[PDB]
Design a protein around this ligand. Structure first.
Ligand SMILES: CCN(CCC(=O)O)C(=O)c1cccs1
Length: 330
């Protein structure tokens, strides 16, 4: 089997991408944030505290003839940005882009933190990291991809995120018309539960490529590119007037600047992030101080190849027995 679904930016900055997902019978379509940095499929629901729902579409398990409570199961998750959610668990039929999984754990939120409530465009998350990170207790549950894998034509999914435009998530096949050149594949470590890999270096603008190993994760659920302070300083030093501000929370630069590109290495290959992808626009409405798309990871503990980086590529998440990541230009 295969599936193919369009993913759409939630706003004009590409802060996140939503993908429609069919849950239950008859189908309830919710728009979920596909997140290769986590491993829970959770939704706003008829069980969510009413004051914490503000415009989201909810899953109502009592209206689904295929829903079943997963007795005793609870979940609770905290994300790197400080947001969180928790609740109980149903199994139900879940379909993405024509690919159907029966018996998928659908984690129904009883509580969500304010950042979720305040984002009316995201009805939940669909985790695509390794199932060892799933938070369901006392019996850990599998991701949608793990449940689908055996049925797929090939045990892969691909992320093709757009710049200020829709893109595609495909399951079970590699669309050879969706990228240019070849795909260069790189080894993955699953030791932390992430799609963790080692970039071979970077260049700033037209500058020389610096060969240096940068371990990090491919995370579609993180907006920006978080890299070591040395690398980030080298980038922003090429932008007149750019500076790091603790009170704003990262590197800001003049909205009148033209940003240089940023290149990252994948083996001997190179992925070029255009400068315009690094502009996250005014810090506040009307401000001439623009918020940078490349930020330091020094306070995170891990480097993160988020959407800024991934949307410059066609990315293969290869879930074979020995997993690998693939990157192509497009
Ligand atoms: C020989 C280089 N090479 C292949 C890169 C390519 O796709 O061309 C590799 O080392 C690996 C790929 C995946 C796991 S290791």
């Amino acid at each position: 089997s295969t599936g193919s679904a369009t993913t759409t930016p939630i706003d004009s900055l590409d802060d996140a991408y939503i993908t429609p997902v069919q849950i239950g019978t008859p189908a309830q379509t919710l728009n979920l944030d596909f997140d290769t940095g986590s491993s829970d499929l959770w939704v706003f629901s008829s069980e969510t505290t009413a004051s914490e729902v503000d415009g989201q579409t909810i899953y109502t398990p009592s209206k689904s003839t295929t829903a079943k409570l997963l007795s005793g199961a609870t979940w609770s998750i905290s994300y790197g940005d400080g947001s969180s959610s928790s609740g109980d668990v149903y199994t139900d039929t879940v379909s993405v882009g024509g690919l159907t999984v029966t018996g998928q754990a659908v984690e129904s939120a009883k509580k969500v933190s304010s950042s979720f409530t305040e984002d009316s465009t995201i009805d939940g998350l669909l985790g695509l990291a390794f199932s060892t990170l799933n938070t369901v207790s006392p019996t850990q549950q599998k991701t949608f991809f793990d449940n689908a894998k055996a049925s797929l034509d090939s045990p892969v999914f691909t992320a093709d995120l757009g710049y200020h435009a829709p893109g595609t998530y495909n399951f079970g096949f590699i669309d050879t018309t969706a990228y240019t050149g070849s795909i260069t594949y790189t080894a993955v470590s699953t030791k932390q539960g992430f799609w963790e890999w080692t970039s071979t270096g970077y260049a700033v603008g037209s500058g020389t490529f610096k060969s240096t190993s940068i371990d990090g994760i491919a995370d579609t659920g993180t907006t920006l590119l978080y890299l070591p302070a040395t690398v980030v300083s080298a980038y922003w030093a090429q932008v007149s007037g750019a500076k790091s501000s603790s009170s704003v929370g990262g590197y800001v630069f003049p909205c009148s600047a033209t940003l240089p590109s940023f290149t990252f290495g994948v083996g001997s290959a190179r992925i070029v992030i255009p400068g315009d992808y690094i502009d996250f626009g005014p810090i506040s409405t009307g401000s001439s101080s623009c918020f940078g798309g490349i930020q330091s990871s020094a306070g995170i503990g891990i480097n993160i190849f988020g959407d800024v980086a991934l949307k410059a590529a066609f990315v293969v998440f290869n879930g074979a027995t020995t997993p690998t990541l693939g990157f192509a230009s497009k």
